[PDB]
Design an enzyme around this catalytic site. Structure first.
Site, PDB file in Angstrom:
ATOM      1  N   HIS A   4      32.829  25.906  86.326  1.00 26.34           N
ATOM      2  CA  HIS A   4      33.113  24.843  85.548  1.00 26.34           C
ATOM      3  C   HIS A   4      33.964  25.342  84.352  1.00 26.34           C
ATOM      4  CE1 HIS A   4      29.327  26.281  82.811  1.00 26.34           C
ATOM      5  NE2 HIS A   4      29.449  26.180  81.696  1.00 26.34           N
ATOM      6  N   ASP A  42      28.779  29.058  90.621  1.00 22.09           N
ATOM      7  CA  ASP A  42      29.482  28.491  89.118  1.00 22.09           C
ATOM      8  C   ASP A  42      30.128  29.764  88.961  1.00 22.09           C
ATOM      9  OD1 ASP A  42      30.362  27.448  86.951  1.00 22.09           O
ATOM     10  OD2 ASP A  42      28.243  27.560  85.835  1.00 22.09           O
ATOM     11  N   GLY A  48      29.257  26.662  74.726  1.00 25.77           N
ATOM     12  CA  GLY A  48      30.440  28.095  74.141  1.00 25.77           C
ATOM     13  C   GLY A  48      29.632  29.062  74.260  1.00 25.77           C
ATOM     14  N   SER A  65      29.224  30.100  77.811  1.00 26.04           N
ATOM     15  CA  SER A  65      29.224  29.460  79.179  1.00 26.04           C
ATOM     16  C   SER A  65      30.672  30.304  79.662  1.00 26.04           C
ATOM     17  CB  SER A  65      29.212  28.448  79.835  1.00 26.04           C
ATOM     18  OG  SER A  65      28.449  27.419  79.095  1.00 26.04           O
ATOM     19  N   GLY A  66      30.490  30.868  80.822  1.00 23.55           N
ATOM     20  CA  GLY A  66      31.366  32.177  81.252  1.00 23.55           C
ATOM     21  C   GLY A  66      30.580  33.423  81.066  1.00 23.55           C
TER      22      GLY A  66
HETATM   23  N1  801 Z   1      20.393  26.329  77.679  1.00 22.40           N
HETATM   24  C1  801 Z   1      21.764  27.404  77.789  1.00 22.40           C
HETATM   25  N2  801 Z   1      20.948  28.156  78.317  1.00 22.40           N
HETATM   26  C2  801 Z   1      22.854  26.974  78.740  1.00 22.40           C
HETATM   27  C3  801 Z   1      23.675  27.184  78.504  1.00 22.40           C
HETATM   28  C4  801 Z   1      25.529  26.869  79.112  1.00 22.40           C
HETATM   29  C5  801 Z   1      25.586  25.610  78.519  1.00 22.40           C
HETATM   30  N3  801 Z   1      26.576  25.350  78.166  1.00 22.40           N
HETATM   31  C6  801 Z   1      25.726  23.844  77.655  1.00 22.40           C
HETATM   32  C7  801 Z   1      26.170  22.732  77.761  1.00 22.40           C
HETATM   33  N4  801 Z   1      28.040  23.370  77.715  1.00 22.40           N
HETATM   34  C8  801 Z   1      28.689  21.843  77.875  1.00 22.40           C
HETATM   35  C9  801 Z   1      28.150  20.241  77.080  1.00 22.40           C
HETATM   36  C10 801 Z   1      27.104  20.581  76.617  1.00 22.40           C
HETATM   37  C11 801 Z   1      26.314  21.115  76.250  1.00 22.40           C
HETATM   38  O1  801 Z   1      25.171  21.153  76.486  1.00 22.40           O
HETATM   39  N5  801 Z   1      24.200  23.700  77.527  1.00 22.40           N
HETATM   40  C12 801 Z   1      24.080  25.147  77.970  1.00 22.40           C
HETATM   41  C13 801 Z   1      23.204  25.772  77.293  1.00 22.40           C
END
Ligand code: 801
Ligand code: CA
Length: 223
Positions: free
Chosen positions: A40, A84, A175, A177-178
């Site tokens: 993503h 993913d 932020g 992610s990845g």
């Molecule tokens: N709780 C987590 N471990 C988590 C991890 C990555 C995420 N990425 C996002 C997110 N990404 C893109 C747009 C909105 C989001 O809330 N929420 C997230 C929550």
């Protein structure tokens, strides 16, 4: 990272920042020319930034290299986020040293209870956006499959695992992610999704990298 601590400059040498004019996702260096991140996080116009600590200041040790190609898993489903994972090939190899180093892929999956290190420049607040300038770290355990499936009923596939704290307060967030989930020196997870950040009973969900090692090796070998 919510509830985490400052990692310290270059203490996480395989962490990369994916930049398109601003930091948008994290990633892991697995060899001098390949990075693994989440499908993503895909977009065109990606510059990979290695040796970073403060993403808004050049302080030395940084290497900015453009991505030559990004390979999103063919079976990636953007609605369930199953598979993913994405590989990015760099335009030139990175110079590895003690500040920029690759992380090893696992030979076996990790078990619940294993403690792992998650890092990133993602949001540090569970309610509101506060993005840090330097890399944050969080130590979290992998949870059992029953607690994961009880937390996200019907949304966990066998290519996902939960890590975190059910009491809330500590978790990865937007932020992040990845980015990497490293346990015992091996890359075991990729930050993928979660419901909000650091909410009680809503642990983070991660891509289970041990299920893709043969795919990563075959794909890098043919590209
Ligand atoms: N709780 C987590 N471990 C988590 C991890 C990555 C995420 N990425 C996002 C997110 N990404 C893109 C747009 C909105 C989001 O809330 N929420 C997230 C929550
Ligand atoms: Ca910097």
């Amino acid at each position: 990272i919510v509830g985490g601590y400052t990692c310290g400059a270059n203490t996480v040498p395989y962490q990369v920042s994916l930049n398109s004019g601003y930091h948008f996702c994290g990633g892991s260096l697995i060899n001098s020319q390949w990075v693994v991140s989440a499908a993503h996080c895909y977009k065109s116009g990606i510059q990979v930034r290695l040796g970073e600590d403060n993403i808004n200041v050049v302080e030395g040790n940084e290497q900015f290299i453009s991505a030559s190609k990004s390979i999103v898993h063919p079976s990636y489903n953007s609605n369930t986020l199953n598979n993913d994972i994405m590989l990015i090939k760099l335009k030139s190899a990175a110079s590895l040293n003690s500040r920029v180093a690759s992380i090893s892929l696992p030979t076996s999956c990790a078990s619940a209870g294993t403690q792992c290190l998650i890092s990133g420049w993602g949001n540090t607040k569970s309610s509101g956006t506060s993005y840090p300038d330097v890399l944050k770290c969080l130590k979290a355990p992998i949870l059992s499959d029953s607690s994961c499936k009880s937390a996200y009923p019907g949304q966990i596939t066998s290519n996902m695992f939960c890590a975190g704290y059910l009491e809330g307060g500590k978790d990865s967030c937007q932020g992040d992610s990845g980015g990497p989930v490293v346990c015992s020196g091996k890359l075991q997870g990729i930050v993928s999704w979660g419901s909000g950040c650091a909410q009680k009973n809503k642990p983070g969900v991660y891509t289970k990298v041990c299920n893709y090692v043969s795919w990563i090796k075959q794909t890098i070998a043919s590209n």
